[PDB]
């Protein structure tokens, strides 16, 4: 992760001005800054959601696990199991793959080449995201934070703030990521739940960027601290 000459100005209020940062691999970086400093905005740049007005932001090709600061509930009726299952692309590819099969019957000798390639990638990708996960997720809840299975069938919007944070945190881990971008991972957690998160993040071998306002939580995990300045608009 590297950024050069970073510039970003929403309207009249600017975020980055010729900012730069280099993060080495396998660095548990603690991102710190006052509210509005632009900590969440940095992840949006890493996730390519935002584009710098000027400058270059460089990200590795590895898969990124992103924990949003706000829970993303697309529909009110979504169940906890549906929310977690959406972490992995198993369901999305199958729906695409099922359509590919429909096209194969309809089309005889026109699109077969394109369809066959798309089918092949989906199968290889599906096997890469081994479809055995259906059982692994069920037990990831148990071993993660003692999340009861009754919640598993309940609408996500009805969960408590602390419960939602567990689900969202579990979803990130469920995705099996390579780089961890955690945006306030313990916002609503209680003391007991925070203990599990700390222990897992200490053991996590990969790179993990953490946006947190909990100094003690960071101190136990962070080895490198990145400070986003609000007045100098620098890093």
């Amino acid at each position: 992760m590297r950024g050069q000459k970073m510039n970003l100005t929403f309207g009249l209020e600017e975020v980055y001005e010729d900012a730069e940062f280099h993060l080495g691999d396998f660095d548990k970086v603690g991102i710190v800054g006052v509210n509005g400093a632009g900590k969440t905005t940095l992840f949006r740049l890493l996730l390519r959601e935002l584009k710098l007005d000027k400058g270059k932001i460089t990200i590795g090709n590895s898969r990124i696990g992103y924990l949003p600061q706000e829970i993303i509930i697309m529909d009110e009726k979504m169940t906890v199991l549906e929310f977690l299952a959406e972490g992995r692309p198993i369901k999305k590819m199958e729906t695409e793959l099922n359509y590919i099969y429909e096209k194969l019957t309809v089309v005889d000798d026109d699109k077969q080449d394109r369809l066959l390639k798309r089918m092949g990638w989906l199968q290889e990708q599906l096997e890469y995201f081994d479809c055995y996960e259906a059982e692994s997720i069920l037990l990831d809840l148990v071993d993660s934070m003692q999340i009861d299975f009754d919640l598993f069938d309940q609408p996500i919007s009805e969960l408590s703030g602390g419960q939602k944070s567990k689900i969202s945190f579990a979803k990130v881990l469920y995705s099996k990521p390579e780089i961890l971008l955690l945006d306030q991972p313990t916002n609503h957690l209680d003391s007991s739940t925070k203990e599990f998160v700390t222990k897992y993040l200490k053991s996590y071998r990969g790179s993990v960027l953490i946006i947190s306002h909990d100094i003690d939580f960071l101190n136990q995990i962070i080895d490198k601290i990145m400070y986003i300045d609000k007045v100098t608009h620098k890093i």
Binding site: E102, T105, M119
Partner: peptide, 15 residues
Amino acid sequence: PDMMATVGKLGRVLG
């Protein structure tokens, strides 16, 4: 090719 659409349901087991 045509069969794969019918086969795929079984293929989930074959996978």
